[PDB]
Design a protein around this motif. Sequence first.
Motif, PDB file in Angstrom:
ATOM      1  N   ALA C 304     -16.414  41.471  11.118  1.00  0.00           N
ATOM      2  CA  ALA C 304     -16.115  40.322  11.592  1.00  0.00           C
ATOM      3  C   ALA C 304     -17.418  39.483  10.996  1.00  0.00           C
ATOM      4  O   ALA C 304     -18.603  40.022  11.291  1.00  0.00           O
ATOM      5  CB  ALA C 304     -15.964  39.801  12.990  1.00  0.00           C
ATOM      6  N   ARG C 305     -17.186  38.426   9.858  1.00  0.00           N
ATOM      7  CA  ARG C 305     -18.470  37.812   9.563  1.00  0.00           C
ATOM      8  C   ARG C 305     -18.715  36.619  10.101  1.00  0.00           C
ATOM      9  O   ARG C 305     -17.739  36.028  10.853  1.00  0.00           O
ATOM     10  CB  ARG C 305     -17.985  37.529   7.941  1.00  0.00           C
ATOM     11  CG  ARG C 305     -17.915  38.551   7.058  1.00  0.00           C
ATOM     12  CD  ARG C 305     -17.211  38.453   5.865  1.00  0.00           C
ATOM     13  NE  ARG C 305     -16.675  39.853   5.301  1.00  0.00           N
ATOM     14  CZ  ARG C 305     -17.266  40.034   4.276  1.00  0.00           C
ATOM     15  NH1 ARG C 305     -18.237  39.389   3.547  1.00  0.00           N
ATOM     16  NH2 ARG C 305     -16.943  41.415   3.745  1.00  0.00           N
ATOM     17  N   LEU C 306     -20.179  36.176   9.991  1.00  0.00           N
ATOM     18  CA  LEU C 306     -20.470  34.768  10.695  1.00  0.00           C
ATOM     19  C   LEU C 306     -20.894  34.093   9.508  1.00  0.00           C
ATOM     20  O   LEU C 306     -21.830  34.496   8.581  1.00  0.00           O
ATOM     21  CB  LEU C 306     -21.763  35.174  11.507  1.00  0.00           C
ATOM     22  CG  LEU C 306     -22.249  33.812  12.102  1.00  0.00           C
ATOM     23  CD1 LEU C 306     -21.326  33.412  13.185  1.00  0.00           C
ATOM     24  CD2 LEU C 306     -23.641  33.905  12.404  1.00  0.00           C
ATOM     25  N   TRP C 307     -20.166  32.963   9.433  1.00  0.00           N
ATOM     26  CA  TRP C 307     -20.476  31.904   8.299  1.00  0.00           C
ATOM     27  C   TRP C 307     -21.147  30.549   8.921  1.00  0.00           C
ATOM     28  O   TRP C 307     -21.212  30.601   9.993  1.00  0.00           O
ATOM     29  CB  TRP C 307     -19.068  31.460   7.636  1.00  0.00           C
ATOM     30  CG  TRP C 307     -18.198  32.788   7.028  1.00  0.00           C
ATOM     31  CD1 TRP C 307     -17.405  33.309   7.921  1.00  0.00           C
ATOM     32  CD2 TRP C 307     -17.884  33.096   5.928  1.00  0.00           C
ATOM     33  NE1 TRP C 307     -16.695  34.426   7.216  1.00  0.00           N
ATOM     34  CE2 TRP C 307     -17.305  34.414   6.042  1.00  0.00           C
ATOM     35  CE3 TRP C 307     -18.698  32.903   4.445  1.00  0.00           C
ATOM     36  CZ2 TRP C 307     -16.597  34.894   4.720  1.00  0.00           C
ATOM     37  CZ3 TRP C 307     -18.330  33.477   3.536  1.00  0.00           C
ATOM     38  CH2 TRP C 307     -17.420  34.447   3.722  1.00  0.00           C
ATOM     39  N   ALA C 308     -21.598  29.716   7.944  1.00  0.00           N
ATOM     40  CA  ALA C 308     -22.232  28.658   8.418  1.00  0.00           C
ATOM     41  C   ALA C 308     -21.715  27.370   7.774  1.00  0.00           C
ATOM     42  O   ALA C 308     -22.523  26.383   8.338  1.00  0.00           O
ATOM     43  CB  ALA C 308     -23.648  28.746   8.183  1.00  0.00           C
ATOM     44  N   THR C 309     -20.708  27.282   7.104  1.00  0.00           N
ATOM     45  CA  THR C 309     -20.054  25.959   6.312  1.00  0.00           C
ATOM     46  C   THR C 309     -21.176  25.647   5.517  1.00  0.00           C
ATOM     47  O   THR C 309     -20.899  24.294   4.924  1.00  0.00           O
ATOM     48  CB  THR C 309     -19.670  24.893   7.289  1.00  0.00           C
ATOM     49  OG1 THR C 309     -20.891  24.097   7.728  1.00  0.00           O
ATOM     50  CG2 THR C 309     -18.807  25.597   8.576  1.00  0.00           C
ATOM     51  N   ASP C 310     -22.327  26.313   5.171  1.00  0.00           N
ATOM     52  CA  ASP C 310     -23.103  25.582   4.028  1.00  0.00           C
ATOM     53  C   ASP C 310     -23.388  26.821   2.842  1.00  0.00           C
ATOM     54  O   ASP C 310     -24.044  26.372   1.813  1.00  0.00           O
ATOM     55  CB  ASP C 310     -24.592  25.560   4.856  1.00  0.00           C
ATOM     56  CG  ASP C 310     -24.710  24.052   5.182  1.00  0.00           C
ATOM     57  OD1 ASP C 310     -23.928  23.205   4.885  1.00  0.00           O
ATOM     58  OD2 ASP C 310     -25.503  23.939   6.250  1.00  0.00           O
ATOM     59  N   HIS C 311     -22.952  27.980   3.147  1.00  0.00           N
ATOM     60  CA  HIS C 311     -23.390  29.102   2.295  1.00  0.00           C
ATOM     61  C   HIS C 311     -22.130  29.778   1.857  1.00  0.00           C
ATOM     62  O   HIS C 311     -21.116  29.672   2.826  1.00  0.00           O
ATOM     63  CB  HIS C 311     -24.175  30.331   2.886  1.00  0.00           C
ATOM     64  CG  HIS C 311     -25.165  29.625   3.645  1.00  0.00           C
ATOM     65  ND1 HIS C 311     -26.577  29.314   3.386  1.00  0.00           N
ATOM     66  CD2 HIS C 311     -25.294  29.227   4.861  1.00  0.00           C
ATOM     67  CE1 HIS C 311     -27.373  28.967   4.330  1.00  0.00           C
ATOM     68  NE2 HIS C 311     -26.479  28.678   5.400  1.00  0.00           N
ATOM     69  N   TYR C 312     -21.833  30.265   0.689  1.00  0.00           N
ATOM     70  CA  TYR C 312     -20.537  30.866   0.110  1.00  0.00           C
ATOM     71  C   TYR C 312     -20.480  32.348   0.661  1.00  0.00           C
ATOM     72  O   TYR C 312     -19.356  32.900   0.594  1.00  0.00           O
ATOM     73  CB  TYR C 312     -20.378  30.765  -1.147  1.00  0.00           C
ATOM     74  CG  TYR C 312     -21.754  31.421  -2.011  1.00  0.00           C
ATOM     75  CD1 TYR C 312     -23.003  30.769  -2.326  1.00  0.00           C
ATOM     76  CD2 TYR C 312     -21.755  32.413  -2.627  1.00  0.00           C
ATOM     77  CE1 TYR C 312     -23.782  30.910  -3.077  1.00  0.00           C
ATOM     78  CE2 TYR C 312     -23.013  33.199  -3.185  1.00  0.00           C
ATOM     79  CZ  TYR C 312     -23.833  32.263  -3.529  1.00  0.00           C
ATOM     80  OH  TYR C 312     -24.898  32.867  -4.237  1.00  0.00           O
ATOM     81  N   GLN C 313     -21.595  32.925   1.365  1.00  0.00           N
ATOM     82  CA  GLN C 313     -21.787  34.338   1.904  1.00  0.00           C
ATOM     83  C   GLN C 313     -21.885  34.068   3.103  1.00  0.00           C
ATOM     84  O   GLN C 313     -22.621  33.144   3.677  1.00  0.00           O
ATOM     85  CB  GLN C 313     -22.899  34.898   1.013  1.00  0.00           C
ATOM     86  CG  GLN C 313     -22.627  35.471  -0.328  1.00  0.00           C
ATOM     87  CD  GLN C 313     -23.785  35.688  -1.196  1.00  0.00           C
ATOM     88  OE1 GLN C 313     -24.841  35.258  -0.987  1.00  0.00           O
ATOM     89  NE2 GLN C 313     -23.356  36.409  -1.923  1.00  0.00           N
ATOM     90  N   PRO C 314     -21.807  35.249   4.025  1.00  0.00           N
ATOM     91  CA  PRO C 314     -21.768  35.010   5.396  1.00  0.00           C
ATOM     92  C   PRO C 314     -23.202  35.249   5.700  1.00  0.00           C
ATOM     93  O   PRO C 314     -24.185  35.541   4.709  1.00  0.00           O
ATOM     94  CB  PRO C 314     -21.108  36.209   5.825  1.00  0.00           C
ATOM     95  CG  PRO C 314     -19.967  36.639   4.756  1.00  0.00           C
ATOM     96  CD  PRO C 314     -20.827  36.230   3.503  1.00  0.00           C
ATOM     97  N   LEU C 315     -23.743  35.107   6.884  1.00  0.00           N
ATOM     98  CA  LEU C 315     -24.918  35.468   7.559  1.00  0.00           C
ATOM     99  C   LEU C 315     -25.051  36.595   8.370  1.00  0.00           C
ATOM    100  O   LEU C 315     -26.040  37.271   8.181  1.00  0.00           O
ATOM    101  CB  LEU C 315     -25.336  34.283   8.469  1.00  0.00           C
ATOM    102  CG  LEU C 315     -24.950  32.755   8.208  1.00  0.00           C
ATOM    103  CD1 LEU C 315     -25.274  31.849   9.359  1.00  0.00           C
ATOM    104  CD2 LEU C 315     -26.051  32.126   6.970  1.00  0.00           C
ATOM    105  N   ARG C 316     -24.180  36.989   9.059  1.00  0.00           N
ATOM    106  CA  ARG C 316     -23.869  38.038  10.019  1.00  0.00           C
ATOM    107  C   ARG C 316     -23.002  38.891   9.810  1.00  0.00           C
ATOM    108  O   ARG C 316     -21.658  38.091   9.696  1.00  0.00           O
ATOM    109  CB  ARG C 316     -24.128  37.764  11.481  1.00  0.00           C
ATOM    110  CG  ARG C 316     -25.394  37.235  11.968  1.00  0.00           C
ATOM    111  CD  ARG C 316     -26.421  38.146  11.713  1.00  0.00           C
ATOM    112  NE  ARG C 316     -27.815  37.479  12.122  1.00  0.00           N
ATOM    113  CZ  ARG C 316     -28.627  37.190  11.261  1.00  0.00           C
ATOM    114  NH1 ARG C 316     -28.412  37.147   9.753  1.00  0.00           N
ATOM    115  NH2 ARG C 316     -29.972  36.698  11.573  1.00  0.00           N
TER     116      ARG C 316
END
Lengths: 132, 404, 487, 120, 89
Positions: C304-316
Amino acid sequence: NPADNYHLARRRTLQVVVSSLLTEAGFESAEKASVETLTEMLQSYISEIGRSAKSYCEHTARTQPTLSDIVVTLVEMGFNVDTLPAYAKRSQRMVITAPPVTNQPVTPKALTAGQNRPHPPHIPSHFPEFPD
Amino acid sequence: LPSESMKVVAESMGIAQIQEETCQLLTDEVSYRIKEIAQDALKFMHMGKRQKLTTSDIDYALKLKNVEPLYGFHAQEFIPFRFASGGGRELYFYEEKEVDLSDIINTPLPRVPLDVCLKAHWLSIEGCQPAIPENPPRLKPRSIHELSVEQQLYYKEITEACVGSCEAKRAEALQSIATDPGLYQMLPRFSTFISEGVRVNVVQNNLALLIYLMRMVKALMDNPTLYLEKYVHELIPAVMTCIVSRQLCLRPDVDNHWALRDFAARLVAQICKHFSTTTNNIQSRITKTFTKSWVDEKTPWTTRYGSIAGLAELGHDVIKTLILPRLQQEGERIRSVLDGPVLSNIDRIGADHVQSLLLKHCAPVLAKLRPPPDNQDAYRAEFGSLGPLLCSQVVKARAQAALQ
Amino acid sequence: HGDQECYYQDDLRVLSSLTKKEHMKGNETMLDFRTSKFVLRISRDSYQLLKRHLQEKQNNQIWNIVQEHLYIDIFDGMPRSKQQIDAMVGSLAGEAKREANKSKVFFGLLKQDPNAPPQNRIPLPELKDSDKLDKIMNMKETTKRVRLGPDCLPSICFYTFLNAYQGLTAVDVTDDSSLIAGGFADSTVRVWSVTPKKLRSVKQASDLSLIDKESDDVLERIMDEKTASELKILYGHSGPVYGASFSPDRNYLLSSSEDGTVRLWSLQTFTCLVGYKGHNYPVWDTQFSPYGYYFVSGGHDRVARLWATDHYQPLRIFAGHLADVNCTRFHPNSNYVATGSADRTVRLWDVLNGNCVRIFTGHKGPIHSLTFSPNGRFLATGATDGRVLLWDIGHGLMVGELKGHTDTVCSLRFSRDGEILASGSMDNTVRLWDAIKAFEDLTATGHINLPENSQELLLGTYMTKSTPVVHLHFTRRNLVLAAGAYS
Amino acid sequence: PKDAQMMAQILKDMGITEYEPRVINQMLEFAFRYVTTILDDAKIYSSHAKKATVDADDVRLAIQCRADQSFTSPPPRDFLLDIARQRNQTPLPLIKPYSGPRLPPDRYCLTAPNYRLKSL
Amino acid sequence: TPLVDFLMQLEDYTPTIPDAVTGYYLNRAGFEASDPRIIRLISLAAQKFISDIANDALQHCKMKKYTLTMEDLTPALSEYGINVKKPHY
């Protein structure tokens, strides 16, 4: 049954198209398995310019595809696009009709008008009214 | 898979003389791939909320295993036909395996169904599920009636609207009878109101009162929720009585409005003939009463006309087997009315209506079992009743068949 | 294989197919089962009889398999009953250790609560004046909110999809009952307005350049009336749309599909904005954070990926499951992400450090629904066995089990007060459970000896006409909404 | 057929109770496609080894050289846990307070002027 | 530019496949009907592909006309690099 008529209204329109394209300078009375073969290659061909010209435009950060996205899509399927203005101006060219609509009446219901009861304050006014 | 089938496939390809261990090696590899895909196509079925395993689930299960959902053709090139599917091949076991190429063009295309819309309703009202069509549904104590006062008021409004003072009121009340799901447990009181009404409404022949009650019967029948054959025995006399009884009012004029009654009434009786059917109870009983109404001597020209109509819509075979040996009697009755010479009685009107109806039935009874040859004077062997006009009716029926 | 438990029947038929080595070398679930250790929580009163039958050299090889492939986590207490062991087993690598369920979890709500995390723990976005204007009209709805309890049972308004011959795969409703999204198998997302207020797009850039800003109404002057429908169809997924998630500010629809992308649709322009391509595999679920910046998406690739609507890549990347991450749910404070999965485990993940802080095992089928209590102290999970298991989060002892449903429980939600948990399944029933009498009682042994309180906790069953209850929603005046796609 | 009655038993052994009449027809179409590309490659490998009979080592070669290209799998657990700890070590970035609509750089979004041809 | 001059002449010329059917399989893949002349080129490019196969399978039927068979589609698609399959069921 209107459930399988969602698919069979458009696949049996592609069967009339292949039956109209195999008659133009060609056949009568084709084999049955040869018609469902060719209309399966026709549906898979429209669905492949759908997926690939959407992919070529969205690669260029756009959402709807222009002409320059399909003339690169058809090149990547090996089409030789320049022969298409000569194919469109046939004298044998035919038009296959679109499929009929299930809701021909559209508005045939007199309905049953019954109103009783109001709304408690945890139900707003835009929800349906309480029945009779 | 059967190993015998794999041998058939191998020798129909150019690979002959295959061993059994070579052939068993093929049928455990491909039977695993069918089991691997059908277990993988069940993932798309469970994520579909459809518990169906449609034909498209195997198209996505194949694409998931990096195999083209290409069916019946395999492109070693791949570029023109990638993992997009073509929807399979519409093929059968009992198929013809050869069709004409203009048969597929001339058939009408199926109707594209309605698009998806969002309607809201109520699963529950403060804990109770409503009975809307979107949902599945020593002194002894003073008892209560089994109807509510909203239900009793509804019954009073529907019955006072169904006696037809205003036409829009009738039509809604008839649609309300035709589709109320909770109209059971009120149905004894509706059946009793119908039955009792016709019997005290033929004491004075009040045609509207009767035409409204027959429309109420027709609206009771096409309701799918309620169980009617517990009240079917009570219903049969009331619908039947309006069609063949004598008319205490005026037979000559509202004759047609009385034949229109006989029509919407033949509808409820026809429902009784088609539905509610068990062995030798309902259809044969009304058929026997209609035939002894017909064979009846000096019958009223109103009762005669009604019974003639009633025996007429009994379907295809009933006029094929019953109206046949009786043309001479019909002709003799017509000749007596014609002799008269008094035209004061309703007898002449009754005779004309009976003859017209019998002649139309005889026309297709003939169009149905025989070619249309010698349509000029061969019908003079059947007393010459309809003759060339009957032949013209048969020709019109043939034209309608050609249009179909 | 015949002398196994009845809830392992779908697990053994994957093993009956596995007969070769190369068949198992590409399975990646039995490949991770062979390298991990079964945890096998046993008591010390029963472990003494086991070790007195294995330390002797008469057996000497099954003891070698046990100490190579099996962990044994020993607790000092009573040996559990058979209907209590049956309640907490059923997962590969089953019954995880108590040392995993002893980390400190900030399960409290934000704004004192000692279980609450600080506001600057996770960098949450600011609260704008339009977002502060939303909570002003939200507490006007809370004024009319009814206390549900076991007496004042709520009214359920079913929003059925009537035709739906493209298969409906995803529903979401906004927090105020104003929009309903539908994810369908024909690769479309369709937004419906349910209030009497048509869906409008904002005006084009030429029309906005001629009007002026800061007019103290510019949230109405920009909405185009030429585009006003009761239905907006969104195209762009090349596959069936499996997840659907609204943002709490009622913009920013989210959708995930079979093609491996998560898509962020605007609800002011009604176009697609971003396509988040991190999975190559079907993304089975997505959800926005309850504060609306981060979002979590779980897919077939067992993360499961954590995204932020600001990066094309996930955070967690939450990468500890052994099968598909079916569900992904945020905590009400959005510091924790619960990911149910197909290996019959539910796992809480801290957004800081990406660490798994809780492992909840005890389901017999793949988990198809998760929800959190509005307190933040509890978590209800549903799966294909028809069981709704209620877990604690500070203790994670799964204090309850609700076993009324027959088929896959595909939707759960608690009330706005927390008084009632609503459950919707493929049995075409909306069951209501008493979510106050379920948590009334709430360690050193890892279990609480949960009773058969299912009959007492039922308030109603509410059979639906041939319609599987895909979504369950609670209006802010405590009215149940459900959406089904009538079959 | 017989090849079709065994296909209804492979699905019933996998617990698939409800299916479609054409599910069987196209798993047989895939099973036929798969065996006529193993055996087609098996006689290519037999002609490489120069033997007139396609024996069992040719089918052992043609299976494992088709399964090396066709049937792939998700990435393994030792690969997923290495790219996780390489990614989860990087701390979370702070957020600018009034940046606007939070989006990636414009070459990673789908927001372009999005032209079309003039109708003439 | 001939192909731009060609597509500007397609407000008329209804092709052999309808645009309600070509547009259905384009909507299935995300292609939405912005310009109806754009649909008619895709419907023409899909006609020309099927017509080029049926015109080359006729040459493989004259050597062995009046019926299109699977043994005519097999060498016709073999120069295209497409191995067609006989159902054999």
